[PDB]
Write an enzyme that holds these catalytic residues in place. Structure first.
Site, mmCIF file in Angstrom:
data_model
loop_
_atom_site.group_PDB
_atom_site.id
_atom_site.type_symbol
_atom_site.label_atom_id
_atom_site.label_comp_id
_atom_site.label_asym_id
_atom_site.label_seq_id
_atom_site.Cartn_x
_atom_site.Cartn_y
_atom_site.Cartn_z
ATOM 1 N N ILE A 4 -66.896 73.626 116.148
ATOM 2 C CA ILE A 4 -67.601 73.094 114.873
ATOM 3 C C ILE A 4 -67.395 71.530 115.190
ATOM 4 O O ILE A 4 -66.282 71.000 115.397
ATOM 5 C CB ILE A 4 -66.856 73.620 113.575
ATOM 6 N N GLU A 131 -60.022 77.453 90.855
ATOM 7 C CA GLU A 131 -58.776 77.874 91.285
ATOM 8 C C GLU A 131 -57.596 77.268 90.603
ATOM 9 O O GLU A 131 -56.590 77.819 90.476
ATOM 10 C CB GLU A 131 -58.865 77.923 92.795
ATOM 11 N N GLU A 132 -57.505 75.935 90.191
ATOM 12 C CA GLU A 132 -56.475 75.067 89.871
ATOM 13 C C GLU A 132 -56.325 75.560 88.484
ATOM 14 O O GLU A 132 -55.098 75.303 87.993
ATOM 15 C CB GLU A 132 -56.872 73.656 89.850
ATOM 16 N N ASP A 160 -57.474 76.949 102.331
ATOM 17 C CA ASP A 160 -56.978 75.977 101.004
ATOM 18 C C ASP A 160 -56.380 74.933 101.558
ATOM 19 O O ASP A 160 -54.793 75.562 101.985
ATOM 20 C CB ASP A 160 -56.492 76.840 100.018
HETATM 21 N N1 LIG Z 1 -53.551 76.974 95.911
HETATM 22 C C1 LIG Z 1 -52.787 75.492 96.023
HETATM 23 C C2 LIG Z 1 -52.512 74.886 97.312
HETATM 24 C C3 LIG Z 1 -51.423 75.528 98.186
HETATM 25 C C4 LIG Z 1 -50.113 75.189 98.196
HETATM 26 N N2 LIG Z 1 -49.405 76.332 98.787
HETATM 27 C C5 LIG Z 1 -50.136 77.074 99.231
HETATM 28 C C6 LIG Z 1 -50.130 77.979 100.364
HETATM 29 C C7 LIG Z 1 -50.943 78.886 100.823
HETATM 30 C C8 LIG Z 1 -52.264 78.536 100.445
HETATM 31 C C9 LIG Z 1 -52.519 77.380 99.702
HETATM 32 C C10 LIG Z 1 -51.474 76.717 98.852
HETATM 33 C C11 LIG Z 1 -53.684 74.534 95.173
HETATM 34 O O1 LIG Z 1 -54.888 74.756 95.076
HETATM 35 O O2 LIG Z 1 -53.040 73.302 94.852
HETATM 36 CA CA LIG Z 2 -64.332 70.824 116.751
HETATM 37 ZN ZN LIG Z 3 -56.039 74.268 97.076
HETATM 38 ZN ZN LIG Z 4 -54.365 72.310 94.268
#
Ligand SMILES: N[C@@H](Cc1c[nH]c2ccccc12)C(=O)O
Ligand SMILES: [Ca+2]
Ligand SMILES: [Zn+2]
Ligand SMILES: [Zn+2]
Ligand SMILES: N[C@@H](Cc1c[nH]c2ccccc12)C(=O)O
Length: 273
Positions: A4, A131-132, A160
């Site tokens: 990529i 998601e938040e 993520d």
């Molecule tokens: N989901 C979290 C980010 C995150 C924190 N610890 C994690 C462990 C695994 C995957 C994602 C995360 C957010 O959006 O802020």
């Molecule tokens: Ca690459």
């Molecule tokens: Zn995140």
């Molecule tokens: Zn986040």
């Protein structure tokens, strides 16, 4: 799998940064920077030949969206999914959290079309909203996916936060075949990984879909041992700008973004054969 191009991933981040700047400084649920993020990603996918769906939901009094992109073809009874949340918190542009995952998943979906790939398994990519707010978009998708289609899912891969400036290389310890595919890619680079010890794979995992994913760290502190194996700064957060206004284009480690984008494509090709 193809390699990529890092520059292509970085260019999606630059577009998301401009979108945040043009929309009050953020890409958050219920604010115009989120839907503008969706529109940018969707237009790229449509032009490459994806069948895209805008899945609407309401949370917190405001309309949210998931963007679903199906690559035409492949076995309808064996669907491999990959996704990333596309919303930020409202304090900033959310370039590492989670423009990084969103851009790697988008560039992998574009790479399928550029390669003329015909996977044996049907490929479906997703960009989650809200998601938040507590996984609201991915919970909505799983809650509205009929059981007959749930059973057709071969796996869900989640990306993520994959560009943290002081990165670790964490691989989820969930489905064993998916975890081994990611670890095999990193082994070819001679880059060690650690098990990941709260993202959009959770609603899939909880209804028995095999899951896995990649993560480079957030607010926790990098240890001495982790700095010895990966470089960076012991005693500083993996992401010093987690959920902050400084989660900008400057808040990216290019090497981590490149490695995790390439690993994403590697796993998507391997697991769709
Ligand atoms: N989901 C979290 C980010 C995150 C924190 N610890 C994690 C462990 C695994 C995957 C994602 C995360 C957010 O959006 O802020
Ligand atoms: Ca690459
Ligand atoms: Zn995140
Ligand atoms: Zn986040
Ligand atoms: N992201 C760059 C480091 C960096 C921080 N700020 C920058 C501004 C311009 C160019 C590079 C940078 C890297 O990973 O090496």
């Amino acid at each position: 799998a193809p390699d990529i191009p890092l520059a292509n991933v970085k260019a999606h981040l630059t577009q998301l940064s401009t979108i945040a700047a043009n929309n009050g400084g953020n890409r958050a649920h219920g604010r115009p920077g989120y839907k503008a993020s969706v529109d940018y990603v969707k237009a790229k996918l449509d032009a490459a030949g994806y069948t895209t769906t805008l899945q609407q939901f309401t949370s917190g009094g405001a309309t949210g969206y998931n963007l679903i992109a199906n690559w035409p073809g492949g076995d309808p009874n064996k669907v491999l999914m990959a996704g990333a949340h596309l919303d930020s918190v409202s304090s900033g542009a959310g370039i590492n959290d989670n423009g990084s995952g969103s851009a790697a998943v988008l560039e992998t979906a574009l790479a399928v079309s550029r390669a003329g790939y015909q996977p044996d398994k049907h490929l479906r990519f997703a960009w989650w909203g809200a998601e938040e707010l507590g996984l609201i978009g991915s919970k909505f998708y799983v809650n509205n996916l009929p059981s007959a289609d749930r059973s057709k899912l071969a796996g869900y891969l989640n990306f993520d936060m994959i560009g943290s400036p002081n990165p670790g290389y964490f691989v989820y310890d969930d489905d064993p075949v998916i975890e081994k595919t990611f670890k095999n890619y990193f082994a070819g680079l001679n880059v060690p990984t650690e098990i990941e010890t709260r993202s959009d794979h959770a609603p899939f995992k909880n209804v028995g879909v095999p899951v896995g994913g990649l993560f480079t760290g957030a607010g926790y502190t990098k240890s001495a041992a982790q700095a010895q194996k990966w470089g960076g700064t012991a005693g500083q957060a993996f992401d010093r700008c987690y959920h902050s206004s400084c989660d900008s284009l400057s808040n990216i480690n290019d090497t981590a973004l490149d490695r995790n984008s390439d690993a994403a494509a590697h796993a998507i090709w391997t697991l769709s054969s």
